[PDB]
Amino acid sequence: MCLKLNLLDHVFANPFMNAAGVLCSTEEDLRCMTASSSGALVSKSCTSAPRDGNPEPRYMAFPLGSINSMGLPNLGFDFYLKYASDLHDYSKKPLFLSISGLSVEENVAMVRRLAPVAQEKGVLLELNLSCPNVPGKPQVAYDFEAMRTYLQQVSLAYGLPFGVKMPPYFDIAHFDTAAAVLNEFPLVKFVTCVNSVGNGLVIDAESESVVIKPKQGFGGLGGKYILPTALANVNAFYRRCPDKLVFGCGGVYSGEDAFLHILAGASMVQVGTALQEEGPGIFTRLEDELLEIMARKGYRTLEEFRGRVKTIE
Amino acid sequence: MCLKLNLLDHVFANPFMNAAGVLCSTEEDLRCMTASSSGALVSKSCTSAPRDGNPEPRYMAFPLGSINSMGLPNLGFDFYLKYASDLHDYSKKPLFLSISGLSVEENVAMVRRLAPVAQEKGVLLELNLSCPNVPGKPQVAYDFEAMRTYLQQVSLAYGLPFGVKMPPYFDIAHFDTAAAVLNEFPLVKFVTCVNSVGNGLVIDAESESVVIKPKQGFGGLGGKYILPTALANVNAFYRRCPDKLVFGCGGVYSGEDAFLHILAGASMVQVGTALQEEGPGIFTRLEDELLEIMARKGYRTLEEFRGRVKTIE
Ligand SMILES: Cc1cc2nc3c(=O)[nH]c(=O)nc-3n(C[C@H](O)[C@H](O)[C@H](O)COP(=O)(O)O)c2cc1C
Ligand SMILES: Cc1cc2nc3c(=O)[nH]c(=O)nc-3n(C[C@H](O)[C@H](O)[C@H](O)COP(=O)(O)O)c2cc1C
Ligand SMILES: O=C(O)c1[nH]c(=O)[nH]c(=O)c1Br
Ligand SMILES: O=C(O)c1[nH]c(=O)[nH]c(=O)c1Br
Structure with missing residues (x-):
């Protein structure tokens, strides 16, 4: 039994990856995540110019x-692009690049330059709509008109499949509205739930x-604080976006936690806090533990239980 | 060393009470909370008619x-009103009555009837603008125009000091807007942060x-999942509503948690999940533990540290 899967025209050895921002800011970091047993990696959210944060x-x-x-401390989009274009070994695992411009114009500028590298190398865009830490710049995806503008402009400028890093929501009407916005955009092929x-x-x-x-x-x-919120959001979007992939993030420390994300609907499972605290060795443990739960339950594949969380009556 | 507080023209032996909904639906529940060591009690959120939930x-x-x-299961407004009017022993401790009508009109109907009892007996209104669990009813406090309507209609119909039970927010812009709304209404004398x-x-x-x-x-x-969310919302409103009181609710299991709430700006401190799990004996424990922290620190009263959380630099 192996956990390999195919999504977004790429092959993955297992559904595990770092969460954006953790272990992915420097070339050293990215080489470390590449050398780990994770199934993929994602770069630190970047801006056009470098930032100390x-x-x-x-x-x-x-x-x-x-x-x-x-x-949003980062080395600048030029660095992450160059990593994607020249340095990453795509034979090891797929790469996602997170972009987090502070205006729609800044994101459009980056995506126009990422597009040729995505065509040539297959690097995947994760558009960050959910940074909650830059003063005076509230989370984009909590303003649905701003979210729509960003996704119109990026879709037009980029012209290729991409994903979105969503903030958690806490209200059914929000889930309804946010998912209907996402569903207006066929180029959004994956939705990562959730940011902090x-x-x-x-x-x-x-x-x-x-x-x-x-x-x-x-x-x-x-971390542990946010697992039920993360699960709710993964399932909410998995129910409302039947033609898109949902990537789970939030509260993963164990194979058991990953199992729940996948039951909720997760295709990939991203690991932030627990990765920051334990280091990249966590990926071999997570894989061992998920395999073990699967064996005990008789599951042979992820697809057998993805999204198959049961409700009562 | 002393847990006493005086506010809203009432005297409290200590700052602890139940969170609305826990140990407060039946006459039995209410007598039990009255007999406990809590400083006050709040009744189950009620609707005009009884509800099974x-x-x-x-x-x-x-x-x-x-x-x-x-x-929102409850025995109906007529019962909680009668409780406040004929049954509650006000010599034991103050009583809050939570109202959670499903429309502005239901709320107004209730507060018109509550007013003479509040005047005669000194029962305190907590208006629930944050129920997250009735289908097709996204919570009022997440729609700032609806929130403003509710507060205008209730202020006009009730005409007396009251407070509001707020949902958690997660965005600085939302803190800013919500607090500004509340600041429009001088009869809103306290703000309870947070609902679930x-x-x-x-x-x-x-x-x-x-x-x-x-x-x-x-x-x-x-419960434990929500303590830092709750502390953030207590402090956000404490900073933004300098003319109002803030009651803390969310994640209190210990005297230490209560201390954090109070540092963050809380006046009263409400106990939900931990009270549901441990029972009303929790109140003597929380009092002893808070007194122990105060003694270690040389604090003789609550106002020596309320709102005095330190920031860095
Ligand atoms: C130190 C740190 C930096 C992060 N940086 C980013 C980032 O650059 N982009 C982003 O989308 N999310 C970022 N996040 C959020 C994580 O990707 C993730 O969504 C969140 O931490 C929840 O997952 P967890 O419970 O596994 O920590 C960051 C989180 C942490 C702790
Ligand atoms: C069983 C239950 C019933 C509740 N009912 C109400 C209610 O009727 N009205 C209300 O404002 N909040 C209600 N709440 C929310 C609590 O008052 C409180 O805001 C929330 O549980 C967070 O506090 P805690 O972390 O101490 O549980 C209820 C919570 C629980 C667990
Ligand atoms: O402060 C960060 O850099 C950061 N931190 C987060 O928790 N999520 C993000 O999207 C970002 Br960009
Ligand atoms: O479902 C409830 O009764 C309930 N449960 C909560 O967590 N908060 C509320 O405001 C209510 Br009214």
Whole structure:
């Protein structure tokens, strides 16, 4: 039994990958994720020009998960493009490139230049509509008219299949509306649910202080805190977008957690906080553990249970 | 060393109370909360007519918290009004009455009838703008125009100080807008943050099934999952509504959690999931544990640290 699968005209050894932003900012990082046993990797969300991001401390982890307001620190689109065009070994695994421009115009500018490299090399675009940590720039996908504009302009400028990194929603009417926007765009072939649960606040009792410096301590939550929210969103979009793929992200620490994402509808499963904390060795453990649950249940393939979560009556 | 507070023209032995919906639906529940060591109590959110609610199982709890889609089961407004009017012993502690009509008109109908009782007895209204579990009713506080309508109509019909039960937000722009809305209404004297993180999905790996029957398993999350979300919303409104009180709710299991809430700006501190799981004995524990933290830190009263969370730099 092997976990290999085919999606988006690519082959994957297993459904596991890093979550964007974790272990993927530098050439070193990307070579490390390439050398891991993950089935694919995704680059750090990038902007046209390099960014240092927010002041430190900007990430902190706890038994139940993490908080971050990194502020989109990255090496600049030129670097990530060059990685995709010249440095990545596509014979090892597929690559996704995350773009996170701060305006529609900035995203269009990047996608116009990524297009030829996607045609030549097969690198996959993940368009980030859900950064909750840049001051004065609220999450795009929480403004449905802004989300539609971004997806119109990118689709026209890019002209090739791509995916979108979605924020979590918490209301059935939101799920309905967000999915109907996505469904207006046939080039959106995958939807990654979810980005961090925005603007939580961790406080240290002893010091009486917030734990990250930017935004008065406010930052996106990841980890054990967000698994039920992540599952809800994966299933919501999997139910509402029957002609698109859903990639699960949020709260994955174990094979058992990945099993639930896949039951909810996930095709790929992305690992953020747990990867940041454990390191790339987590991928061999996740694979071993998912295989073991599958064996105990008699499943031979992922397709046998993907999206097959049961409801009561 | 002292847990006493005085606000809204009432005196409280301590800041703890039940979160609406937990241990407060029947006369029995209400007498039990009255006999406990809580500083106050709040009744089940009510509608004009009695309601059975959703099918069972509709609540489930786990180590990291709870999921519920109760469906607003309640004995009806006439019962909670009579409770406030004839049955509650106000010499024991103050009473809040939660109202959660399904339209502005239902709300107005109720508050017109509550007013003379609030005047005579000193019962305090908590208006629920955040139920996430009645199908086809996306929560009022997520539609800022609807929210404004509700508050205008209720202010005009009720004409007395009241408070509001708010959903969590996850976007700084939403904090800004919601608080600005609330700031329009001078009769809104307190803001309870937060209701359950809406429409999460708990899935049992062994049975491959969702764990609650209603809404295909989608329900509101409470407990450990939500503490940093709750602290963020408490602080966001504390900072934005300097002329109002903020009551904290979400993730309180310990005196330490309560301390964090209070640091974040909370006046009263409500206990939902942990109270449902542990029972009303929790209140003596939370009091002892909060007093222990205060003593270690040299704090003699709540106002010495309320709202004094430190930020970095
Ligand atoms: C340090 C850090 C940086 C991240 N950077 C990005 C990013 O650049 N782009 C993005 O789409 N999401 C980013 N995220 C969000 C993760 O991709 C992911 O959606 C979120 O952390 C939830 O998954 P988890 O529960 O496995 O952490 C970041 C998360 C962390 C903790
Ligand atoms: C079984 C149950 C019933 C609830 N009913 C109500 C209610 O009637 N009205 C309301 O405003 N919130 C209701 N809530 C939400 C709680 O008041 C509270 O906002 C939420 O559970 C988060 O607090 P916690 O983390 O302490 O559970 C209910 C929660 C549960 C678990
Ligand atoms: O602050 C980050 O860089 C970051 N952090 C997140 O949690 N999600 C994102 O999309 C981004 Br771009
Ligand atoms: O389903 C409920 O009764 C319920 N459950 C919640 O979590 N919050 C509410 O406001 C309500 Br009214």
